[PDB]
Each structure stands twice: as C-alpha cells, then as structure tokens.
Amino acid sequence: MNVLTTSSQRGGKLFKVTMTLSPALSHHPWPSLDTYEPSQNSYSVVVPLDRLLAEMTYIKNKGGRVLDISPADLEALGPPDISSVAIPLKVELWAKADVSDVQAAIVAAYKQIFGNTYVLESERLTSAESLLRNGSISVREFVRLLAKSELYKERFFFCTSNNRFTELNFKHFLGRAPYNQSEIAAHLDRYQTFGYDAEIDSYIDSDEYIQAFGENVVPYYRGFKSQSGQTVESFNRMFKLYRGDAGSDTNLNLQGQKRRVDPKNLLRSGRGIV
Amino acid sequence: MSVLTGDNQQRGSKLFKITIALSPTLAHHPWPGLDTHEPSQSSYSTIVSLERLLPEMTRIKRNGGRILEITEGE
Amino acid sequence: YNQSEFVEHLDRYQKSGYDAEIDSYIDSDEYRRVFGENTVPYFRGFKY
Amino acid sequence: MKTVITEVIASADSQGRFLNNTELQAANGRFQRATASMEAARALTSNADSLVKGAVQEVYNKFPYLTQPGQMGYGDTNQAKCARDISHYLRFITYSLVAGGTGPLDDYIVAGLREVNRTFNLSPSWYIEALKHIKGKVGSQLSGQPLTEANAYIDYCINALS
Amino acid sequence: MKTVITEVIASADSQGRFLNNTELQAANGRFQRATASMEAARALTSNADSLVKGAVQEVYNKFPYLTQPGQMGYGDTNQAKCARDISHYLRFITYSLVAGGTGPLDDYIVAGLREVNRTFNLSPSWYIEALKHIKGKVGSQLSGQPLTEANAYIDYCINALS
Amino acid sequence: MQDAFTKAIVAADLRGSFLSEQELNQLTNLVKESNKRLDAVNAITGNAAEIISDAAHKLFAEQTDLIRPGGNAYPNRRMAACLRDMEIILRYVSYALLAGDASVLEDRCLNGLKETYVALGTPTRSVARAVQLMKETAIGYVNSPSGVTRGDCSALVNEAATYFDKAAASIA
Amino acid sequence: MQDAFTKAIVAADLRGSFLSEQELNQLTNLVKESNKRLDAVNAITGNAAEIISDAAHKLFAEQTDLIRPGGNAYPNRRMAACLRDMEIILRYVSYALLAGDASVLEDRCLNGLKETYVALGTPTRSVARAVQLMKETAIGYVNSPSGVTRGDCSALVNEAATYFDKAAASIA
Amino acid sequence: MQDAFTKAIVAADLRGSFLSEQELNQLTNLVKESNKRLDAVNAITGNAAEIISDAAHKLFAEQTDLIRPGGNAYPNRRMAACLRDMEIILRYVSYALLAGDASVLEDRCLNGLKETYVALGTPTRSVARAVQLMKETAIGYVNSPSGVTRGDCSALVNEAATYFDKAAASIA
Amino acid sequence: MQDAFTKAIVAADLRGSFLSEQELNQLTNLVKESNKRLDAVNAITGNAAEIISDAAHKLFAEQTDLIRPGGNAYPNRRMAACLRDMEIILRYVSYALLAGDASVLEDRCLNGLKETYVALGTPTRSVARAVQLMKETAIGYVNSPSGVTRGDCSALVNEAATYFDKAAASIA
Numbered sequence A: 001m002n003v004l005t006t007s008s009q010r011g012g013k014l015f016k017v018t019m020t021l022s023p024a025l026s027h028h029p030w031p032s033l034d035t036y037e038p039s040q041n042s043y044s045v046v047v048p049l050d051r052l053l054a055e056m057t058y059i060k061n062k063g064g065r066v067l068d069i070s071p072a073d074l075e076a077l078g079p080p081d082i083s084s085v086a087i088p089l090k091v092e093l094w095a096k097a098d099v100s101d102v103q104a105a106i107v108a109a110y111k112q113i114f115g116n117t118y119v120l121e122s123e124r125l126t127s128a129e130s131l132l133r134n135g136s137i138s139v140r141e142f143v144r145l146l147a148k149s150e151l152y153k154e155r156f157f158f159c160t161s162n163n164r165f166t167e168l169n170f171k172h173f174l175g176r177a178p179y180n181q182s183e184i185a186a187h188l189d190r191y192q193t194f195g196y197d198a199e200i201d202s203y204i205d206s207d208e209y210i211q212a213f214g215e216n217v218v219p220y221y222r223g224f225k226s227q228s229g230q231t232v233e234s235f236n237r238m239f240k241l242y243r244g245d246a247g248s249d250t251n252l253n254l255q256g257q258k259r260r261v262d263p264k265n266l267l268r269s270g271r272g273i274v
Numbered sequence B: 001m002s003v004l005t006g007d008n009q010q011r012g013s014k015l016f017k018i019t020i021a022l023s024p025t026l027a028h029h030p031w032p033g034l035d036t037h038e039p040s041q042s043s044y045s046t047i048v049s050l051e052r053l054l055p056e057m058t059r060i061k062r063n064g065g066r067i068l069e070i071t072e073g074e
Numbered sequence C: 001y002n003q004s005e006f007v008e009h010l011d012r013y014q015k016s017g018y019d020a021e022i023d024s025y026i027d028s029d030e031y032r033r034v035f036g037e038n039t040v041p042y043f044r045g046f047k048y
Numbered sequence D, E: 001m002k003t004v005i006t007e008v009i010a011s012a013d014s015q016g017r018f019l020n021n022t023e024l025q026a027a028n029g030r031f032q033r034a035t036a037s038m039e040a041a042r043a044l045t046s047n048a049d050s051l052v053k054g055a056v057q058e059v060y061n062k063f064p065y066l067t068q069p070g071q072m073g074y075g076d077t078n079q080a081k082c083a084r085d086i087s088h089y090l091r092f093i094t095y096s097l098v099a100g101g102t103g104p105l106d107d108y109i110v111a112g113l114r115e116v117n118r119t120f121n122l123s124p125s126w127y128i129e130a131l132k133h134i135k136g137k138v139g140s141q142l143s144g145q146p147l148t149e150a151n152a153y154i155d156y157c158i159n160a161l162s
Numbered sequence F, G, H, I: 001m002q003d004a005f006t007k008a009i010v011a012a013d014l015r016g017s018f019l020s021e022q023e024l025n026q027l028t029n030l031v032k033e034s035n036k037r038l039d040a041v042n043a044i045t046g047n048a049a050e051i052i053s054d055a056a057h058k059l060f061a062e063q064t065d066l067i068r069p070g071g072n073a074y075p076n077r078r079m080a081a082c083l084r085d086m087e088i089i090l091r092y093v094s095y096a097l098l099a100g101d102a103s104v105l106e107d108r109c110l111n112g113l114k115e116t117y118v119a120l121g122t123p124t125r126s127v128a129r130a131v132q133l134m135k136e137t138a139i140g141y142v143n144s145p146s147g148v149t150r151g152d153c154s155a156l157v158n159e160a161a162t163y164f165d166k167a168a169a170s171i172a
C-alpha cells in the first residue's frame, strides 16, 4: 500500500490515497476491543480510477478521514534532482562594477530571493536597482530592499500563515531549512511585537547570514550540504522545501500558499519552552 | 557615488553615515584563499536609519571592524 | 444465503463480465468486515 | 564587456582560481574564430554607407505611411536620426564581430532598448525590418563562416527587439 | 562536471539566456582541441601499466626509507594501494583529457584530497614525485599539442597537491 | 551537469577503467559532427523568439479555451507566464543539444514540472502540445537555414526531437 | 572588464566610428601571437604554487624581520595571509596576460590596495619586493618550458613584466 | 454522524453537564419547525433528477469548453461522472437538511474532495458553479411546491443555502 | 493501455478530428513492417531464459560484490528476486515492442520502480547495468535468428533499444 510501483493494469490512472483509520477498517483478530496497528495510523493505498469513488465513500463512512489524493504517476518520479544546487555558483558584486556585472547580480537576486516565481517587467524594483548600480548600496543592502517590498509581501506573506512565511524566509534569505521548532516560535513572537519590518531584519542582520554571504554575495543555496549547528533532519526538510529546478515558491497554486514542512516533523528535532 | 542618494531607501527618521575599517566582518572573497576583501573596502561608508543605527553598530564591533566616523546623513 | 444472491451475481456477470464479478465478492462489505486486508479467506459456515 | 576572454576570466575570478585548461581551450576558440569574424567586420565596415541607406529606405518601403506628413519618417530630422540609428546597429555588430562576443551589443544597444523605444514612440518593427534587409544583402558580400558570424549578430539584434 | 561545454551552458542558464555567439565560439575551442587531447589520452591509456609501475618505484627510489619495515612503503598492501592510487590519478588525467576540462580531476581527486591524505598519513610529496616522474616519461610518448595537454593536467594535479 | 563526454567518463569510472576504444570512437564521432551541432544550436538561438511566437499563435488557434476567461492563458499575467515557460523549455532543449545529453533538461527543467502544473491547475496536455509545436518549427529551422554548407543533419534533427519528446512526455 | 579588443572598441566608439584599419591590424597581430600567449599564461598556471613558494622563501631570506615577533609575516595566521596575497596578485597578473589588458588587475586587485596595507600596518615595500620576486620566477617559466615550439616570446615577457611592475608600483 | 441534537449533546458532555435550558429550547424549536423541514427535504428528493438536469443544462450553456474535446465533461464517460457527482453532492446536502447539521456533508463528501479534483484535473471552479446552480433550483423547489400549507420557510431556505455554500466553498 | 494506433487516435481526438492523412500513412507503414515486428518479438520470447541468464552471468562477473555477503544479490532469496526482476523488465520490453509504444512499460513497470529500489537498498546502478546487458543480448537475437527471411531490421532494433534505454534511464 505504501510506496508504489507501476500505474495501471487494464489501464487506469492509479491514485494513491491516504487516510486515518478507525478500527472499523482493519483491526486485529484479538479477544478485546478493536484496535488498528499503531503504525498504520495513516495509511495509504493505491487504487485505479474506477474503484476510486467507491473506496472513498467507504472510507469516509466507516469513520476514516481522507488526508490526500494524488496521482500515482506524479509520485513515482522520485525526489528532486539536486545537482544544480548541491553546490551552486556564487555570484558576487565587485567594487567598480562593469555595467553588466551588475546585470548578473540583479537577475540572480531575483531568482533566489523570490524563489523562482516570475517577476514580470512591470513588477521589477527599478529605483532600487538604480541604487545598486551607482554603488550607493551593496548586494546585501539590495537584498534587504526586496524583502520589504510589496511584491515580496504580497506573494509570500499576506496570503499564508506565519509558519509558512518564516519557513520561506529561511529558504530565501538563508538558503537553509528551519532547524527547530524554537526557530519558528522565536520568529513568530517577534513579528507579533515589533512588526513585519523588524522581523525581516532579523534574518539579514544575523550572524549566520553574515558569515556565509558577507555583504556582496547574493544569498545562495546551502542546505544540501552539511552546516554548523544544524540538526540532522534539516537535510530532509530541504527536499521538502525545494522541489526541483522547475519548482518555485508560487502563490498561485490551486490550494494556495501552504506549509511544506509538517509541524510534526519539526518537533522531532527537539522541544523545549519559549 | 556612496554619496548617498536621497534617503537611500532607508526610510525611517534620521540618516547617519557611518564609516568603518571593516575586516573580514563582511566580504570575504569566495576564493580559496584566506578571507580577504578587496583592498578598497578598507573603509566602508554606509547609511542607516535611526531605528536601525544601534543594531548595526553592535554587530559591526562584535564582528571586529571598528567604526572610524559617524555623521548625520544629510 | 438466498436465490436472489445467485440472480444478482448471474446478472452482474452477464452485464460486466468475469473480472467485475470477482471484484464484487472482494469489495463486498462482508469480505471487509470479517477478513479485512491482511487475513486469508477461511471457512465460516460452521459458526452461527 | 562580454567576450569569450572576459567570460572565462570572470568565471575563474569568481572561484578564486587560476585559469586552467578548460578556460584556455575556450580562449583558443575565440582566437581561432577571429579570422572569419574579422572578415565579416571588414566587409560590413566598408559597405556601411550603402547598407545603412538600403535599410533606411526599406523601412519606408515596408511602412509607406511613415513618409507622409505628420508621421515619423517625414522631414530631414527623423530621416536623419533613422540613418544614424541603423548606423549605430551596424557599428555595434562590427564591434561584436571584432570583440568575440555580444558585449558591445549588450552594453550599448540592448541594455535599456525597450524603455527608450517606448518613451520615444519608436516601433521595433522598423528596426527588425532594417536588419532583415541588411541580412538579405550581406548574403552576397560574404559566405562561409564570415557570413555565419554576420548572421549570428544580426539575428541577435532581431531577437533583442522581439 | 567542469568542461568547456558545461561551463558555457552554466553561464547562460544563470542569466536565463540562450547560448549566443560568445558561448558557441568557446565550444568550438573544446571541439577543435579534442584531437590533441585524445591523442594524449590514447598514449597515456595504453602505457598506463608501465607509467604506474615507473612512478610507484620512483616514490621508493626518491624516499628510500619508505621500503624499510615499519614504514608505509612496506608489505604487499601498502605497495598495492600505492600503484592503485597513481593509477587513479592517471585514469582521471585521461578522463580530463577526453572531457575537455578539469572536472573529473576536480570532482574525484581534488575535492577532499587534503582531508583524506591528512587522516591517512599520506604525504603529498610522494604523489608529486610520482607525477613528476610520469611527466618525465610522457616527454617521449607525445609531442606538440598532445604533450602540452598531458602536461597541463599533470601539472594541475601537482598544484592541487602543493 | 553532464555532457556526452562526461557521461562516458561516469560509466567508465563505475567499471574502474580507462575509457574503452568502443567509447573513445563514439566520442571521436561527436567531435566529427560538432560543426553541424553548432549550426543546429545556432538555428534555435537565432530564431528563438519566432519559434515561441509561432508555436504560441498555433497553440491558441487550436485551443481557444485557454484565452477565454476561465482559461489558463488568460488574462495578460497568465499569458506572459505561459510565453515565459515556452521560452524556458526551448532554452534547456538548446542546452541539451549543445551538450549531446538530456541531463540539464531533465534535472533543471523537467524534474518536478508536471506536479507544479497540476498544483497550479495548468493543463498539462496543452503544455505538451505547445512543446510539440516548438519542436516542429525548431527542426524546421535546423533543416533550412542561411547559407550553411549542404549536408545531412538528420541524426541531429532526431536527437533534438528526442529532447522535445522527453519534455512532452514528462509533462503531459 | 576589458580585454585588448574591448579596449579598441571603447576608443573607437568615443570617436563615433567603425574601427580604424590601424586598430584592426593591431588586433590581427594579437590573434597572430595568441598561441604564444596561451603558452605564457599556461606557464604561470602550471607553476603557480612554486612561483609563490620560491618568491616567498627568497622574500624572508632577505627580510628576516618579517618572521620575527613584531613582524608582519608572524605568526602563522599572518604568514598565511601574506602567502594568500601573493597568490591573489599572481592570479590577476595571469588574467591580465590572457586578456592583453591590465584593467582586471587595476580594477579588481590594485585599486585601494596600498591604502588597505597602510591601514593594516603591512609594509608595502616588502609587498612590492615579493611581487618583484614573483616576476623574476614567473618570467623564468614563461621563457624555459616543457617542449613548447621554439620561438621569440620577448614581446609577451615584456608585457607580463609591466603587469608585475604595475602592481609593484601601485603598492610600494 | 451528528444531527442537531447530537451536536448539542457532545458540547454538553464536554462541560460534564446536563443540557442547558438554553440548549433545550433551541432543540424544542427544531422540533417545532420539523414538519416544514420534512417538506423541505421532500422538495429536494421529489425533484432530484430535474435539479441535477437543470443545473447541468445551465452549467454547459455557460461553459461550452467542458463539452469540447479537451474538456472535463467530454466524452460520455466523463459527463456521466460529472452528472454522478452532481447527484452525490445534492444527496449529502439533503441529508444535512434532514439532520440540521452539516457534518455528514463535510465528513462523507467534502473531506478531501478538492484534492481529488485537482489530482484528476477536474476544474474546481466549474464544479463550484454546478453546485451554485443546484442551490438556485433546489431552493426554488423548497419555496414553491404542491399544496403545502402556506407559511414562512426562509429560515430553512437559508440553512439549505449554507450547505450548498459550504460545498461550493470547500471545492472551488 | 496504448499501442501505436491508439496513440494516434488519442492525439487526433484532442484536436476533435478524424485522423490526418499524415498519421494514416505512418500507421500504414507500421502495418507494412509488422511481419518483421512479429519476428523481433518472437526473437525475445524464444530466448528469454538465455537472455536473462547471460545478462546475469555477466552482471555478477563485473560486480562480484553483489554475490558477497552484504551484497544485494545474496543469499538465494535475493538472487531469485533479482533474476525475477530481470525477467519482469524483459517481459514489458517485449510487450512494448509488440505494441509499438512504450506506455505499458512506463505505466506497469517503470512507474515508481526507482523509489522502490531505493527504499529496498537495491543498487539502482547495478540494476541499470543488468538492463544494458539484456539489451545487448536481446538485440543480438533480434539480428541473428533461425531461417528468417533476409532484410533490414535496424529500425526495429533501434526502437527495442529505446525501450531498454527508457528502463535503464528510469532506474539508474
């Protein structure tokens, strides 16, 4: 039932389903009380298209809750290829820029900071780019400017929860997944009492940020490689965070901007207080 | 020119122009060799808002570069 | 149980063929309630 | 300014690295290619005068209405600034040929093109048609790898304008 | 894996850009250069056996003490793992020759080299001396641009180890 | 990232071997046909805009639902995204064609792409079709260009097609 | 960034002109000598470590104060910084040599460098000397290499020298 | 499964309490209006086929793309699936209406439904619309039936609407 | 499941059209070469056991680690599983070859396969290699059989190869 092979038999579109079952579907044949196996708390099964409506109806009745439906063939092509991003290409802006040296930087900051969503030409931050070109600001300075912009506020903040925002923030600004439940919490409390702007500053003035990017380096991916003071399970979070080269942050998804890192998963790396 | 243009998108209130002798606080070249920064980044003029003035200075000193000047931005 | 089960199974077999008739026994709520997913079929007619 | 030489040097520098066999092989391409490039350059250089007058006219022949009064192909100043502009394009094409890359085109014509053309009510279609014509005539001034080079850069401008 | 082809493609991709005349000129270098590279590759390939035994021995002749008991050039297993290691280097040299860049060397021998050698008490000096010897003998197996290529990559390894 | 040589090298290394005389000459042939390859990549670069434009005109000619309200290439924002994706895919196909290997296409473009589109509600069958049209026109250009020396480019036209066909298959 | 061609182009453009037949042939000659140039850049790359090492050994042979406590190449941290700077400068000199123009050297390396060293207390005259020693050895290698075709490289040896001499002058 | 009484009971139990006189009379009122409720459920049952049919005719009148090739209500197999889903949703809305609680609708029908449709490529906005049309016609029938005693059914018409609106919201 | 005709039909239908004279003759040609196709499928069926056996002998000749303890084709149970998978893949490749379309191979065999092997700890690169060896021998048989009429089967040998190559690519 778990992770599948194949798609169809006569022909179908197999969908794999996931639920949470009562002892009504599955119980042991024991002398007392009806219980399902504790590890099949959420169970998944792959069903071809016709049997599918009948299965969902049954599951819902006897008590289960469907958690997901997704085609099997989507889910057979693995996990993302990460070769492009295991070790990236760094882009850094020099002291006397060359006229297109600076062109390189802007295109990359865009891609990285905005998480590969398209920024259309009406959309670009032109006045701010003027500034970088003249040297009035530096690459880190410019990077902070994009984050406080409406375009950044609008595709990533306004329409999703704070859990999601912060998780995106780590990916964009720091290039790495969020290590702890404390990190999520520490941030949510800051936004709540100092506002959005103070909270944005907190990733860009951090010691972690400063070491790796310094000030003239565009933030680049770095979570597919071992880092310091990183729990070990933050390397699996990175797969959940980045879905491949053609994937992007996208707020235009049918289901909306949502999570990607399970809250249960974060707790595995440690729980304390505050 | 780092001759600040406008308010340099800092918004906020007053603008202070602070120059520091930064070491590799910032700008280590991505190169294999020894965490240097370009030679002409010995003094780093930078304009910050009044609200962000204190935090920045704290992390400049903390990372070792020393402030060389401070003037109100205008 | 009754001559109705035979007529329903004969009519399903005539309308939908052999594979749909086999699926009708296995997707039955009687199969699910008493074998579930992990139990091999076994003789039951000796217990009320 | 983008050339094969500057590109490989940029890539070395950004990894804090001496030029290695990968980068020197690349450079040899640019140097081996110079002969064809520079033949295209010399032919485009001496025919410049007529290539420009040919393309200017073709803009009016393809957009007849431009040359009527109240229009932007009328009067000495419009028609003068047109010849000049096509001449700028041919000039940067020769530069790109000689330089071993699109740099001169990227830095002096492509960066900013649309903003300028949009503020000044200049249609790219004219410029594409100027270049399509220049491409037609350069078919019989050159051949072989010099023609391929000339074409590469003319087409590069046409894509920049679409 | 760093080759002229992958490098220009990487540079295009990172600017969201089709390959242009700059990048194709570069590629021509790599393709024009293949003949010399691949001649070096074939010569290094068939002489591998003896190039390896020659260099292995030279490590012991230059560091006589290595072959005494209690030392790291003593017993079948050390001397076996040595031949193997030089063979790895020659193998990646041929790969780098064939590939048109240092990629195979960078990815399979350079990345991590010092950490490994330091944990296992392997002195780079041996490996430099193995390679210096291989460089001496390759002087008479090749000449002209095949020799220059062989040299480029042997020297690249020696610099990686200094 | 792989190219056709790098691929050879990886397979050789997995044997623990210097490249086979088999593999050597396969690569000698790639060098033999490399001028043609450069013309083929150049054919696409030199007509990128028209290839996308012409594919586009024809896609919406066929599927007039995409440009109605409710349709996935409506309003201007979505059409620009669709035009942008056409360019991105044509780009990575040209990269694969310079490389002699599909990997850059599969790793940087195709990996995850189908699931992105399904999440977005973008009709993958329409995207597959837009890719089929780009293929027709792109190959058109590879086969009939400006004063290139006359010869046989069918091997390269096939290989380009498989890159277009990979993308189509991966997405539909 | 400029190379020798790009430089020509910038000067031509400032006249509003297509390149002069004067400038054309100057550049035709650079293409003429380019194989030699590649060997010259290759001479430096292939011996970078020894060029730095040998310059270094000799710098401290002469100036034994730098390696005493109180000296600017003491303790290990400072010696590593000094060795690193020797490499950085040799690197930008090799870039200039591939380019046929000093600009990358002046813009990315030499600009501000003297004032950096003075701020640091690094004795610029010693740094200038380390550059003079790198020059001696680097040119040594440019002139006497492995099975390169025999000919005259003095023009290129001069030009390499001026890049070493620019750096020295700029720093002292 | 919950009904309006069962819901009261669950909330009371979570306090550890016998039902509040507050809750008692809210339920006494539901019994008061129950004949009207039975007529309202009967209005839907008695016109189920026409409600689905009329919703359908109108859905495809508006969205003629669904019945073209490429469209999600083409060919016959898909249209039958779409007609079937219209019936399923109308059915669970009628169950909720007999129950005085949405839970059967949310738990057996709406839970997971959106993600099913997205997996399938079924345009959820069109499905939402089909639900809006069923609502219009269903309520039409609740309000204008065969020789039912005259009175005010607006409270029940609202409640039925919220069940239609839940489904729409959940799916779009 | 698709075959080469069925594929044509699906693409035609997505246009809302009767098959193009283009597509008609492509299919007329498939019927033209169908006797050869039957011999090609028959070549594989008639030597299935040897194709698997010979691939196997050679796989373990190369990768003697798989048959050591710790290795993924040790003990007998695992070797039987590995031999079984070789047969399964050869089987779906022969089905694709009768069909003139890869879909049965991709849908019933390759879909999810890589992720299965990774979950199991089965070295995918070794599995890819076993597939490459089956290809060599299978094609060997397609090309040199018992008293078949002499002619050219290279088109079919290519197509068979792409099915072997699909599987390899999908798994590695």
Ligand SMILES: CCC1=C(C)/C(=C/C2=NC(=C\c3[nH]c(/C=C4\NC(=O)[C@H](C)[C@H]4CC)c(C)c3CCC(=O)O)/C(CCC(=O)O)=C2C)NC1=O
Pocket: A022, A023, A028, A033, A034, A035, A036, A037, A038, A039
């Ligand atoms: C493989 C052997 C095996 C285990 C271990 C097992 C655990 C298990 N415990 C369950 C429920 C449960 N387990 C408990 C246990 C507790 N409640 C408390 O407050 C206490 C802290 C704790 C008792 C010490 C309760 C109350 C439920 C019912 C939860 C509910 O339905 O609300 C269920 C859900 C199915 C069911 O209710 O029968 C499973 C599968 N099932 C298994 O097959």
Ligand SMILES: CCC1=C(C)/C(=C/C2=NC(=C\c3[nH]c(/C=C4\NC(=O)[C@H](C)[C@H]4CC)c(C)c3CCC(=O)O)/C(CCC(=O)O)=C2C)NC1=O
Pocket: A127, A128, A129, A130, A131, A132, A133, A134, A135, A136, B005, B006, B007, B008
């Ligand atoms: C706070 C709002 C704000 C202003 C006002 C601003 C001005 C400004 N103008 C600049 C450049 C420029 N400004 C001009 C303007 C002109 N050239 C002429 O010949 C005319 C006389 C004039 C137009 C009327 C030009 C040509 C440059 C580019 C200079 C160069 O790079 O060579 C630059 C350098 C950065 C860049 O090129 O983007 C800044 C910061 N930047 C800002 O952020």
Ligand SMILES: CCC1=C(C)/C(=C/C2=NC(=C\c3[nH]c(/C=C4\NC(=O)[C@H](C)[C@H]4CC)c(C)c3CCC(=O)O)/C(CCC(=O)O)=C2C)NC1=O
Pocket: A160, A161, A162, A163, A184, A185, A186, A187, A188, A189, A273, A274
């Ligand atoms: C998008 C706007 C937004 C919401 C709504 C939000 C909820 C939210 N509540 C949280 C924690 C919390 N929420 C509560 C709330 C409660 N505890 C109780 O016992 C009561 C039943 C309830 C108060 C009525 C508590 C106690 C925690 C801390 C849990 C812990 O760390 O152990 C956290 C974890 C991060 C943190 O602790 O700061 C999030 C993200 N975050 C957001 O950004």
Ligand SMILES: CCC1=C(C)/C(=C/C2=NC(=C\c3[nH]c(/C=C4\NC(=O)[C@H](C)[C@H]4CC)c(C)c3CCC(=O)O)/C(CCC(=O)O)=C2C)NC1=O
Pocket: A116, A117, A118, A119, A245, A246, A247, A248, A249, A250, A252, A253, F066, F071, F072, F073, F078, F079, F081, F082, F083, F085, F086, F088, F089, F108, F109, F113, F116, F120, F122, F123, F126, F127, F130
């Ligand atoms: C790795 C290279 C890469 C690819 C391939 C890529 C695809 C991609 N296409 C997207 C959207 C899109 N793609 C399309 C494309 C189409 N619409 C149609 O109806 C046609 C069938 C088709 C054009 C042929 C549309 C309309 C959207 C916007 C969807 C929306 O926001 O509603 C998005 C969401 C982010 C955004 O809108 O910018 C991604 C990530 N992104 C990448 O970074």
Ligand SMILES: CCC1=C(C)/C(=C/C2=NC(=C\c3[nH]c(/C=C4\NC(=O)[C@H](C)[C@H]4CC)c(C)c3CCC(=O)O)/C(CCC(=O)O)=C2C)NC1=O
Pocket: B023, B024, B029, B034, B035, B036, B037, B038, B039, G066, G071, G072, G073, G078, G079, G081, G082, G083, G085, G086, G088, G089, G108, G109, G113, G116, G120, G122, G123, G126, G127, G130
């Ligand atoms: C753009 C390329 C580039 C250059 C050229 C560069 C130079 C440079 N050399 C530095 C330090 C240094 N440079 C040296 C060099 C020397 N000491 C001696 O006594 C000798 C005379 C000489 C070696 C020949 C030393 C010792 C330091 C450390 C000074 C200190 O921290 O006390 C620093 C300070 C940052 C650091 O220590 O990493 C820079 C920026 N940085 C760059 O990014």
Ligand SMILES: CCC1=C(C)/C(=C/C2=NC(=C\c3[nH]c(/C=C4\NC(=O)[C@H](C)[C@H]4CC)c(C)c3CCC(=O)O)/C(CCC(=O)O)=C2C)NC1=O
Pocket: C003, C004, C005, C006, C007, C008, C009, C010, C011, C013
């Ligand atoms: C192996 C293929 C096969 C056959 C041949 C078959 C016959 C068959 N006919 C049946 C009933 C029936 N068969 C008929 C047939 C007739 N009534 C008349 O008056 C006419 C004389 C005649 C039609 C010409 C009727 C009316 C019943 C239903 C009897 C009842 O339930 O009262 C039943 C009982 C099960 C059911 O009703 O579905 C079987 C098994 N079943 C099979 O699986």
Ligand SMILES: CCC1=C(C)/C(=C/C2=NC(=C\c3[nH]c(/C=C4\NC(=O)[C@H](C)[C@H]4CC)c(C)c3CCC(=O)O)/C(CCC(=O)O)=C2C)NC1=O
Pocket: D056, D059, D066, D072, D073, D074, D077, D078, D079, D081, D082, D083, D085, D086, D088, D089, D108, D109, D116, D120, D122, D126, D127, D130
């Ligand atoms: C270095 C590269 C470079 C380019 C390419 C360039 C284009 C350019 N064309 C301009 C104007 C112009 N361009 C034209 C073009 C034409 N008129 C016609 O008869 C034809 C339809 C057409 C030629 C095909 C016209 C009429 C103007 C005057 C627009 C105005 O000021 O109203 C201007 C405005 C400044 C001016 O009035 O000169 C620029 C900047 N400038 C540059 O610096």
Ligand SMILES: CCC1=C(C)/C(=C/C2=NC(=C\c3[nH]c(/C=C4\NC(=O)[C@H](C)[C@H]4CC)c(C)c3CCC(=O)O)/C(CCC(=O)O)=C2C)NC1=O
Pocket: E056, E059, E066, E072, E073, E074, E077, E078, E079, E081, E082, E083, E085, E086, E088, E089, E108, E109, E116, E120, E122, E126, E127, E130
């Ligand atoms: C793919 C490229 C690659 C390289 C280059 C490589 C080097 C390498 N050499 C090793 C060991 C070794 N290397 C040597 C080398 C020598 N012994 C002598 O007689 C000579 C002095 C010298 C040869 C010049 C010795 C003796 C060992 C055994 C070290 C030990 O385990 O104690 C090991 C440790 C694992 C092992 O024991 O095999 C590595 C990884 N490994 C690789 O995967």
Ligand SMILES: CCC1=C(C)/C(=C/C2=NC(=C\c3[nH]c(/C=C4\NC(=O)[C@H](C)[C@H]4CC)c(C)c3CCC(=O)O)/C(CCC(=O)O)=C2C)NC1=O
Pocket: D033, D144, D145, D148, E021, E024, E025, E028, F032, F033, F035, F036, F037, F038, F039, F040, F042, F142, F143, F144, F145, F148, F149, F150, F151, F152, F153, F156
């Ligand atoms: C700037 C990067 C670059 C390019 C683009 C390049 C092209 C190039 N294409 C060539 C040949 C050619 N190119 C083609 C190409 C074609 N023949 C056809 O009929 C088709 C329409 C087309 C298929 C792609 C053919 C047939 C030859 C002659 C045979 C050969 O040299 O392989 C040659 C050999 C000289 C010649 O015969 O003209 C060069 C140098 N060289 C380069 O350095």
Ligand SMILES: CCC1=C(C)/C(=C/C2=NC(=C\c3[nH]c(/C=C4\NC(=O)[C@H](C)[C@H]4CC)c(C)c3CCC(=O)O)/C(CCC(=O)O)=C2C)NC1=O
Pocket: D021, D024, D025, D028, E033, E144, E145, E148, G032, G033, G035, G036, G037, G038, G039, G040, G042, G142, G143, G144, G145, G148, G149, G150, G151, G152, G153, G156
């Ligand atoms: C991989 C990048 C690359 C390199 C390095 C390269 C080198 C290269 N150097 C060459 C010639 C040469 N190279 C030199 C160089 C020298 N003569 C001396 O006596 C000095 C010691 C040294 C001064 C630098 C000379 C004299 C020639 C022959 C004349 C010429 O071709 O210009 C030639 C022409 C063929 C030959 O005569 O051997 C090539 C291809 N080609 C390339 O594609």
Ligand SMILES: CCC1=C(C)/C(=C/C2=NC(=C\c3[nH]c(/C=C4\NC(=O)[C@H](C)[C@H]4CC)c(C)c3CCC(=O)O)/C(CCC(=O)O)=C2C)NC1=O
Pocket: A049, A050, A051, A052, A053, A054, A056, A057, A060, H066, H071, H072, H073, H078, H079, H081, H082, H083, H085, H086, H088, H089, H108, H109, H113, H116, H120, H122, H123, H126, H127, H130
């Ligand atoms: C719990 C009660 C329940 C619901 C609600 C349910 C929905 C449901 N609708 C389905 C398909 C479907 N649903 C539709 C519906 C539509 N197509 C359109 O274009 C319209 C917008 C819309 C009609 C208004 C279509 C066309 C399919 C078939 C999709 C396909 O196979 O391509 C399927 C896949 C299984 C099957 O096709 O039988 C499920 C499970 N199944 C259930 O058991």
Ligand SMILES: CCC1=C(C)/C(=C/C2=NC(=C\c3[nH]c(/C=C4\NC(=O)[C@H](C)[C@H]4CC)c(C)c3CCC(=O)O)/C(CCC(=O)O)=C2C)NC1=O
Pocket: H032, H033, H035, H036, H037, H038, H039, H040, H042, H142, H143, H144, H145, H148, H149, H150, H151, H152, H153, H156
């Ligand atoms: C078989 C199951 C069953 C049903 C269906 C049932 C219906 C039923 N509806 C009734 C009243 C009624 N039913 C309605 C219904 C309506 N008034 C309108 O104007 C609207 C069009 C419609 C809105 C739903 C009204 C207003 C009354 C009279 C007031 C009342 O008794 O509450 C009554 C009370 C007797 C009467 O006044 O006729 C019964 C028994 N009883 C049952 O046992």
Ligand SMILES: CCC1=C(C)/C(=C/C2=NC(=C\c3[nH]c(/C=C4\NC(=O)[C@H](C)[C@H]4CC)c(C)c3CCC(=O)O)/C(CCC(=O)O)=C2C)NC1=O
Pocket: A005, A006, I059, I066, I072, I073, I078, I079, I081, I082, I083, I085, I086, I088, I089, I108, I109, I116, I120, I122, I123, I124, I125, I126, I127, I128, I130, I131
């Ligand atoms: C639809 C037709 C079909 C295919 C293709 C198929 C593949 C398949 N191969 C499997 C296992 C396996 N497959 C292999 C194969 C290999 N091991 C190696 O090292 C080699 C690289 C390779 C042989 C060339 C091995 C060793 C296992 C057992 C893995 C384990 O249990 O640890 C399993 C798990 C179930 C089982 O072990 O029986 C499936 C489903 N199953 C199918 O029904």
Ligand SMILES: CCC1=C(C)/C(=C/C2=NC(=C\c3[nH]c(/C=C4\NC(=O)[C@H](C)[C@H]4CC)c(C)c3CCC(=O)O)/C(CCC(=O)O)=C2C)NC1=O
Pocket: I032, I033, I035, I036, I037, I038, I039, I040, I042, I142, I143, I144, I145, I148, I149, I150, I151, I152, I153, I156
């Ligand atoms: C029982 C199912 C079945 C089979 C297997 C079948 C085979 C079959 N193969 C045939 C021809 C042939 N088959 C081949 C096959 C080959 N030629 C070669 O040199 C290769 C080694 C091999 C490649 C696959 C060729 C070349 C012909 C003659 C040309 C043709 O008829 O197309 C013919 C035409 C009569 C003849 O010329 O012998 C038949 C009937 N017919 C059937 O009904």
